[PDB]
């Protein structure tokens, strides 16, 4: 294998997993470091997004994956740094050839309006102008989002079970009731997406023997992160959710290494993990900054001509005549 | 003046404007081009954001301008590529030490549920879990968004007038009723933020003599085909009917006669920029910038200069203060004992 | 094909040429290394044409094993066209190149103005590197074998191996000695103009090139457009200008007054795939954090060796783990 | 103080030094890391280059220092990764408007053909064609290089002394006889540039109490095994015998007790830095930088500060027309009528 990972370029083994950090940073996205996002690709052809915070969509688009393959989204919690770029995935996939609705698994809160189902319904209402104007010229079928809201308090319970893939959830201690951690279990592998938490009694039990154990680390201190991973004994630990600059990262590393000796990644954007029977391998992805979307399906639409136009004649009557300025390139192009 | 703009390094004069392109790209995300965003700094100390598209918050933070100086946001329209980072300016700016509500100017639509007020209302309901948890430990008042929703059909009417600065709005032709252009007037200067439109009769008249005139300039149909794999049909219709083509922008800017025109809202790539430039140059001879992320204009009586910003990968960092940020004690914990009895 | 080229990720077909711009600039800056080109042919042959100051960092990010890039053609002896020869010589021979380098370069009007003089004194310049390295490593890969050809010769063959011809012809640039190259193989013709003011040779000997490279700024944009209209290439490439959001736009305008044909404004890591049916332009996306990929009397006096600091205490703990 | 260093933005104090890492890497080329190169700026206006490795000319250029202010160049040793870019400083510098010869200080070897004097003499012969054609249109005086070859064996002896600035040299153990470390002394400050060495008894004694102490720090035997597939045999050897290991570095800096230590000469990557850092910290507890390209140190009475430089992708002007650059008319053309007759 190449010492760096070029997205689009490597076949996945049937008993292989590929996990890509598409965001690793603090609440704000910064230029070096988008907010929390993960892409899981399974050797069976299944692909999931675990969190999709502010700024992460530029990193996801650089994987060259057709939108119709990235329709299942898991949210750890409803911080803007964990789902702020769902709207970019929603609208941009519905302009880049996604033909299915998006599917989102997210936790409930202590009440209706503290839950993922409420949050997504109001986000779609937020962008009603976008939805209603676009749906005049393009079948809206993909503009939907189907929310699978699970119980936040459930202790390591299944929330997903399709095609030999299980996601399970357990609670986190973070800001307010609702956040959770996920175990992804497939073909004898376990991948643990920590989300955000203060040190709790659930993660060390339910994460145990994970091939890849992701956990927040600054909330959870670097000495705790070390205590937690000592207990879990994962094949590989990943620390994330801190700034990657030349004056904390190194003492974070030290602080972990006080109680945890096992294989350890200090996650940065576009860091990549290959899980096979023999190894857990860490590389960097080298991906286009000047990204475009790549076709996959691009599988017709067939728009309804019954829907009312969102224009009035008052607006349409402002059209400028540009027939002259466009004539030459027009002619030449229609040839 | 240095040939590059280092944010926080240059004092802005009394008769001077600085504009930075914090986003210039598309609804398609890309590390090289955030979606549409413009920061304007005036010599009287007033600062404004016009559009705040998905990803732009990375470039806004690179400017070394504290969050409490960036509370006034103007939106041209309600596409994700123009207001998708509002949520991140809201939540991020709040933890970073803004002490006042966010002020958002935005158009109406043809009915309530097509307007900026409904849009911002539902966005705050969307992030209720975020807001209600934050409001436990920080003053909730910076958490508010005050919307100033103005009539989209209005022809060059003032929507804002305070401390010698005026914003005017006029309509655009884009996807449906609601979208607008802005002209910022201050101290003899006019700055025009075109937003998104097909070629229209209002922009050329109301933009006339602007020191800086920004307008959508589309990728050629060839470049649409080259990538989106289109037929010589829906690639063609885009440049004829729905967007402003490079030739259409040329014609509009010939009419405006600005000191300096800015083309934006295209992928600025090694194999796109040159045929877009030539499209404009067919019908417009005058001073032109092919925008990209972190291009900055300095506006003075003598000159409109174009430079690149050489900016840090800077985040705001949490503003834990005394201040106007003291929490309303009477708010309930958002924890139950079930969660809190889980600490290791 | 993928819309960006990822080096080491694409098999070259038997009737395909790949051409990568490893340097496009002036005398050496961060966006933009000095002139260099890598040509990969579908018969398995690889060449470097120019290796200017800074280019090696781009050549190393291609993930090409060192023993595959041992043939170098120099247009001329400006530092912006062979400054990183030494960095190929030393770093190739660290990276485990087992063969010496072969350098084709032109003569001058006299001995001390040609390539053989230049490379001989280059290796004498780095004698201390050479002589200390040769204590531990076999020095056979340290050699540079120079093929010096007549700078005067009008489109004469300088190289002829495995179905690949290089031809040289003269340039007009600083002084006698600079040349242009045509690479021919399997019906294809790739022209490396090097540096020059407009000359009568290039328009004649570049004619019908699959890819024609020419300096463009010495040669005006307008002049470049005049030349390429006469050359009528499948695809033209302008290079050796600064590519900041300013003068490139007018450079592009200048060319289009006289040349309408396919045209690339070369930047670092720009690559062209040449097939029967197309000449395609993509950008190469490659690692900034590159590594090598595999594919005598002592020079110490005892006075020096006597200065060794004992570091046993300090190195014991890591040592008792690593030995395990 | 801005949290990043913008070059050209910050007046240097009369009691202040700025040091910039213009290359931190290895003999394998890499866009992320040019070969060994250091720029040092004193508050008295004097500036020095210590090492000018292959590829470092890009980073020096980004500092917005004109070429006539960078004529003084000190080499630790004659490896490509410490003087490869001399020729680019030589020819680049001259065209750009250096008025005086290059001044180079470097060590002798055990014989003439192992010294800096021989190396530089043959470098100029190598680029005879460049020199002779340039010498037609510019005054040749800038194209000279005055070499100051000092005894490599001398123990902490002065090799340079002027304007209150002193450089001393002492030997290293690296490849064979000839390599050295420098100490720069000015205004009660000491900056040590270690060059390349295996652990030696001289550096600790002569570097003692440096304000900034730079020393080579090797990747782990672990890391050499992963990348280069070296056997446990030859891997352990590099970090035990020929190189300064991360642990060895920590032993030397614990002895030296600098105000601030700098590790360099290693690939600074997301899977190498952390285990290097950990090796130093086995034996050294004091202030430490793990060097990468465009890191900068400010030395004042109160602090040694580490920041990153946020610099533009700058190339030097290109001098044009001056009086000290006017061409020597006695010089012969290098064109023959055969080449001139080819003009179109
Ligand atoms: Zn959170
Ligand atoms: Zn978070
Ligand atoms: Zn729009
Ligand atoms: Zn838009
Ligand atoms: Zn030249
Ligand atoms: Zn060395
Ligand atoms: Zn070295």
Residue numbers in the entry:
A (entry chain C): 15 to 232, 257 to 373
B (entry chain A), D (entry chain B): 15 to 358
C (entry chain D): 15 to 41, 43 to 232, 257 to 334, 345 to 373
Please share excerpts from the published article on this structure.
PNGM-1 is derived from a metagenomic library from deep-sea sediments that predate the antibiotic era. PNGM-1 has both MBL and tRNase Z activities and is considered to be the evolutionary origin of B3 MBLs. The wild-type of PNGM-1 has two MBSs in its substrate-binding pocket, and each is occupied by a zinc ion. The zinc ion in the first MBS (Zn1) is coordinated by the residues His91, His93, His188, and Asp210; the zinc ion in the second MBS (Zn2), by Asp95, His96, His279, and Asp210.
We determined the crystal structures of five PNGM-1 variants: H91A, H93A, H96A, H257A, and H279A. His257 is not directly involved in metal coordination but plays a role in the tRNase Z activity of PNGM-1. As His257 is distant from the MBSs and not involved in metal binding, the Zn1 and Zn2 in the H257A variant are occupied by metal ions. In the structures of all PNGM-1 variants, except in that of H96A, the electron density corresponding to the catalytic water remains despite the complete or partial loss of a zinc ion.
